[PDB]
Design an enzyme around this catalytic site. Structure first.
Site, short mmCIF file in Angstrom:
data_model
loop_
_atom_site.label_atom_id
_atom_site.label_comp_id
_atom_site.label_asym_id
_atom_site.label_seq_id
_atom_site.Cartn_x
_atom_site.Cartn_y
_atom_site.Cartn_z
CD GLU B 36 -2.72 1.28 2.55
OE1 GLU B 36 -2.49 0.55 3.54
OE2 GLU B 36 -3.75 1.97 2.44
CG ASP B 101 6.09 9.82 14.33
OD1 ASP B 101 7.00 10.63 14.05
OD2 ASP B 101 4.89 10.17 14.44
CG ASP B 103 6.92 14.49 15.38
OD1 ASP B 103 7.75 14.28 14.47
OD2 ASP B 103 5.69 14.47 15.18
CB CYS B 120 16.35 26.10 17.43
SG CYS B 120 16.46 25.77 19.19
CB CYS B 123 15.26 21.74 21.11
SG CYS B 123 14.64 22.22 19.49
CG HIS B 158 9.17 9.23 10.49
ND1 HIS B 158 8.62 9.80 9.36
CD2 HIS B 158 8.60 9.86 11.54
CE1 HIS B 158 7.76 10.74 9.71
NE2 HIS B 158 7.73 10.80 11.03
CG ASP B 298 1.16 7.82 18.38
OD1 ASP B 298 0.56 7.02 19.12
OD2 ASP B 298 0.56 8.52 17.54
CG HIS B 307 -0.27 3.84 11.25
ND1 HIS B 307 -1.36 4.62 11.56
CD2 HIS B 307 0.80 4.67 11.22
CE1 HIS B 307 -0.96 5.86 11.76
NE2 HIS B 307 0.35 5.92 11.57
CG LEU B 308 -1.49 4.72 5.34
CD1 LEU B 308 -2.69 5.52 4.85
CD2 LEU B 308 -0.64 4.27 4.17
CE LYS B 310 6.86 13.80 4.63
NZ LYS B 310 6.99 15.22 5.08
CG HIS B 316 7.48 19.78 5.76
ND1 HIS B 316 7.02 21.08 5.76
CD2 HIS B 316 6.95 19.20 6.86
CE1 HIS B 316 6.26 21.28 6.82
NE2 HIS B 316 6.20 20.16 7.51
#
Lengths: 241, 364
Positions: B36, B101, B103, B120, B123, B158, B298, B307-308, B310, B316
């Site tokens: 998929e 994943d 972030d 930045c 972080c 990811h 997550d 699940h999908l 990126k 982006h």
């Protein structure tokens, strides 16, 4: 000097896993009572559960009396316990069909079976463990046992539950963290670089899990394939009541 | 944006490497055709259940639609683009890479220099530690060999773990893997998120070892986690109320986060040695360090086979940046602000090195 001069092969141990079909004969009353007495046993395990806490000495002492009274297989005897073992085997095959009538009943009898298996595995002497692990498909090979004392130091420093004595008497062997799944995901005990320093009871949990898987497949087969055998079903209502 | 995407999907997208990745040598029948894909387009118009018979179909569709964002799904029982032809309930997912994943926005309770979907250089040290901790765990403790780390394009990264055994994992084991990799518990309103037992499993030990290489520079210098009362209140919510007065007095007497953290460790050590029977665990220092530096995830992304998530070498829409791979030999040298929007070759070389390892593992 050197001198000169059958059922042993069926069940070299009291433990059995139902791979081979007993290709022989039975009486009507025989298969009837072989199954029905075990129905009483299934209820009795949970009656003992409501009596007092699972698996204690009170459980152990009463439970073996049930087996002696009910003539099914035991802590393994050297005389003709092969007759109780084949009775246990045959009656197990007979028991597949009664409480397949509902999934809740399936799960009920499965749960008392897991309790019984856990009791039997709790009873085991060392020689039983040594020969059954090799005679069964349940091999689970050990690796580099001399390192266990470095883990006698490290586990003891690293674990609330385990102790130095458990390293030896719950004899430690090396297998992956995944065979101690609940212990890695709870992060309960010393495991390192993906490997677990494992006693027998983890392999007992795996035995119970694969037993449940195989038994569930068999129960699905019981639900599906059985109708050619169903020329008589008069006991099924009395069994589900 | 669309003209840049047209040029990108014509000249720059690595189709041969992408097909080589998701076809896995063609050992399994129609595996890539059962894969998929999902496309997100202009004005967030959306097309799920894309799938391609060969590299040419993939190339044709990506040039035809020129999607803003691409997500990769499971291998299904049938071709996803033909799912309308399948019997009711017979269209099902079967295999999927173990995907993580991460972030930067997930750290907004502990990072101070930035917040929301912005990042930045101060972080992003959290992402260096996150990549290193998760990758080291997947390498050493889980034993998974082929692990592809990819920048999302703006705010995170990811990880795609691509071994065959990994692709065949069940939802329950995937959830267990995430839970094991999740020392940080709870939702946004939970004050204390890491708790440790009196004696500790070696999996956790390694995380503190990695964090120590960066904790000074990140937490004590750039974030200044104990700069003032507002900042140190959030840390005092992690510690026994019996030592709040002593810690507040020591923090007030101390000039900076370096001295304040040293005093926190000294007070925590003395409290640990003095009182055994308290509800708080003894590894308080490790709990604070882990809550301020440990990976965050997550579980829904990883557990769901269908699940999908990126696609590598997608784009982006607002930064214009390509979803490039990250070199595991040079994690600290990666910089999200240097990412391309030819200069794309080093990232494709990382992808090709990963696929050469994959092919050599398959052949050997």
């Amino acid at each position: 000097m050197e001198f000169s001069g059958q059922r042993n092969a069926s069940y070299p141990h009291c433990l059995q896993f139902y791979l081979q079909p007993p290709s022989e004969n039975i009486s009507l009353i025989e298969f009837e009572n072989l199954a029905i007495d075990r129905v009483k046993l299934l209820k009795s395990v949970e009656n003992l559960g409501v009596s007092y806490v699972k698996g204690t000495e009170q459980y152990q002492s009463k439970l073996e009396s049930e087996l002696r009274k009910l003539k099914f297989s035991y802590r393994e005897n050297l005389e003709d316990e092969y007759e109780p073992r084949r009775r246990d085997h045959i009656s197990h095959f007979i028991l597949r069909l009664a409480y397949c009538q509902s999934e809740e009943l399936r799960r009920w009898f499965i749960q008392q079976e897991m309790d019984l298996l856990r009791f039997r595995f709790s009873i085991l002497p060392k020689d039983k463990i040594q020969d059954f692990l090799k005679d069964s498909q349940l091999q689970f090979e050990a690796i580099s046992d001399e390192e266990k004392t470095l883990r006698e130091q490290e586990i003891v420093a690293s674990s609330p539950s385990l102790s130095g004595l458990k390293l030896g008497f719950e004899s430690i062997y090396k297998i992956p963290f995944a065979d101690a799944l609940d212990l890695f995901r709870g992060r309960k005990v010393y495991l390192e670089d993906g490997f677990a320093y494992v006693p027998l009871k983890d392999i007992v949990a795996i035995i119970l899990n694969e037993f449940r898987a195989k038994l569930s497949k068999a129960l699905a087969l019981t639900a599906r394939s059985l109708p050619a055998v169903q020329s008589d079903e008069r006991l099924q209502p009395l069994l589900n009541h | 944006l669309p003209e840049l995407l047209k040029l990108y999907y014509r000249r720059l997208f690595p189709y041969s490497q992408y097909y080589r990745w998701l076809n896995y040598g063609g050992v399994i029948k129609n595996y890539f055709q059962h894969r998929e894909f999902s496309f997100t387009l202009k004005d967030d118009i959306y097309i799920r259940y894309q799938s391609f018979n060969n590299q040419s179909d993939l190339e044709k569709e990506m040039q035809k639609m020129n999607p803003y964002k691409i997500d990769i799904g499971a291998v299904y029982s049938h071709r996803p683009n033909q799912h309308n032809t399948v019997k009711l309930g017979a269209f099902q997912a079967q295999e999927k890479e173990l995907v993580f994943d991460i972030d930067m926005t997930d750290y907004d309770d502990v990072r101070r220099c930035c917040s929301s979907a912005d990042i930045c250089p101060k972080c992003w040290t959290l992402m260096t530690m996150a990549i290193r901790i998760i990758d080291r765990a997947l390498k050493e403790d889980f034993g998974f060999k082929h692990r592809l780390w990819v920048y999302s394009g703006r705010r995170g990264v990811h990880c795609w773990v691509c071994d065959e055994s990994v692709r065949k994992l069940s939802s329950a084991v995937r959830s267990g893997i995430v839970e094991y990799l999740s020392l940080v518990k709870g939702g946004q309103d939970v004050k204390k998120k890491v708790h440790l037992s009196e004696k500790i499993h070696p999996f956790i030990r390694k995380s503190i070892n990695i964090i120590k290489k960066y904790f000074e520079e990140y937490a004590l210098v750039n974030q200044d986690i104990l700069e003032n009362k507002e900042s140190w209140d959030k840390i005092l919510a992690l510690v026994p109320e019996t030592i709040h007065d002593e810690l507040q007095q020591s923090f007030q007497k101390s000039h900076n986060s370096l001295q304040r953290w040293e005093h926190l460790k000294k007070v925590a050590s003395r409290y640990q040695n003095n009182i055994k029977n308290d509800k708080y665990g003894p590894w308080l220092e490790w709990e604070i360090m882990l809550q301020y530096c440990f990976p965050r995830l997550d579980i829904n992304v990883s557990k769901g086979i269908n699940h999908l998530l990126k696609s590598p070498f997608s784009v982006h829409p607002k930064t214009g940046r390509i979803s490039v791979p990250i070199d595991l030999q040079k994690v600290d040298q990666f910089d999200p602000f240097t990412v391309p929007t030819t200069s794309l070759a080093p990232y494709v070389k990382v992808f090709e090195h990963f696929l050469e390892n994959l092919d050599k593992s398959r052949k050997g």
